[PDB]
Amino acid sequence: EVETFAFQAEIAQLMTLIINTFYTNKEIFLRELITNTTDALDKIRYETLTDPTKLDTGKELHINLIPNKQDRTLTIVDTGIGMTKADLINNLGTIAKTGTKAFMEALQAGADITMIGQFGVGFYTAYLVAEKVTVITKHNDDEQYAWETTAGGTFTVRTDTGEPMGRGTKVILHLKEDQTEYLEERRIKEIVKKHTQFIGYPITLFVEE
Numbered sequence: 297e298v299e300t301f302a303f304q305a306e307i308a309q310l311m312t313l314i315i316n317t318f319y320t321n322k323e324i325f326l327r328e329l330i331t332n333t334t335d336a337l338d339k340i341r342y343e344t345l346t347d348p349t350k351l352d353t354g355k356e357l358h359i360n361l362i363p364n365k366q367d368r369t370l371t372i373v374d375t376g377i378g379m380t381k382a383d384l385i386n387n388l389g390t391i392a393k394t395g396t397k398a399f400m401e402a403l404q405a406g407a408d409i410t411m412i413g414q415f416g417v418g419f420y421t422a423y424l425v426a427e428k429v430t431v432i433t434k435h436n437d438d439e440q441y442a443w444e445t446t447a448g449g450t451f452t453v454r455t456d457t458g459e460p461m462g463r464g465t466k467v468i469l470h471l472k473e474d475q476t477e478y479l480e481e482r483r484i485k486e487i488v489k490k491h492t493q494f495i496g497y498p499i500t501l502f503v504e505e
C-alpha cells in the first residue's frame with residue numbers, strides 16, 4: 297500500500313542545499329506555501345467559471361494555519377484544486393528538475409534562497425524548518441493521497457485513510473526542534489502580515505487551548 301520513489305537527482309541536490317546551507321531568513325517558507333495555496337484556489341475558481349459543478353466538493357475557498365505545539369507541527373490547509381496522484385509524483389505539480397537546476401545556478405551567481413519562488417520550486421523551502429513534510433491532497437478527478445518525505449533522497453505516496461478533505465491540500469510540517477518559533481501566534485501573524493498581505497483569500501490562524 298505504500299509506494300517509495302527516488303527524487304530526481306537535481307531535486308535531491310536542492311533539498312540537501314536547503315537543509316545544509318546556513319541561512320537565517322527561514323520565515324520565507326510560509327510565504328511560499330501560502331502562495332501555492334492561493335494559486336491552487338485560483339485554479340479551482342477558474343475551472344468553476346465554465347463548470348460550476350467543480351465546486352460540488354466544497355464551495356468554501358480559504359487557507360487555514362493550524363499550529364500544534366504538542367505534536368510540533370504546523371499544518372497549512374487550503375480548499376484549492378488539489379493534486380492527483382500523478383501530480384504528486386511529478387514533483388507536486390511542478391517542472392522541478394528545470395526549476396531546481398535554474399535556482400541552484402542562480403545561487404552560484406549570487407542569488408539568495410529567498411528567491412526560490414521565482415524558479416517555481418518554493419515548496420522545498422519547507423525543509424528550512426521541517427525535518428519531515430506530509431502533503432495530503434484531494435483533486436476532483438482522483439482519490440485522497442498522502443505524500444511524505446524526510447528528504448534522504450526518497451518520498452512515499454499512499455492512499456490516505458485519514459479524515460476526508462472534500463477537495464484541496466493539507467501540508468503538515470513536522471518542525472525541527474530549534475524551529476518552534478513558527479508555532480507561536482505572534483510570530484506567524486508577523487510573517488503573514490509581512491509577506492502575504494495581498495493574498496485574496498481569508499487566512500485564518502487557529503488558536504490552541
Ligand SMILES: CCNC(=O)c1noc(-c2cc(Cl)c(O)cc2O)c1-c1ccc(CN2CCOCC2)cc1
Pocket residue numbers: 329330331332333334335336337339374376377378379380383388389390416417419433435464465467
Ligand atoms: C492539479 C494541479 N494542482 C495544483 O496546482 C495544486 N493543487 O494543490 C496544490 C498545492 C501544492 C502545494 Cl506544495 C501547496 O503547498 C499547496 C497547494 O494547494 C497545487 C500546487 C502545485 C504547485 C504549485 C507551484 N507552482 C506550480 C507551477 O509553477 C509555479 C509554482 C502551486 C500549487
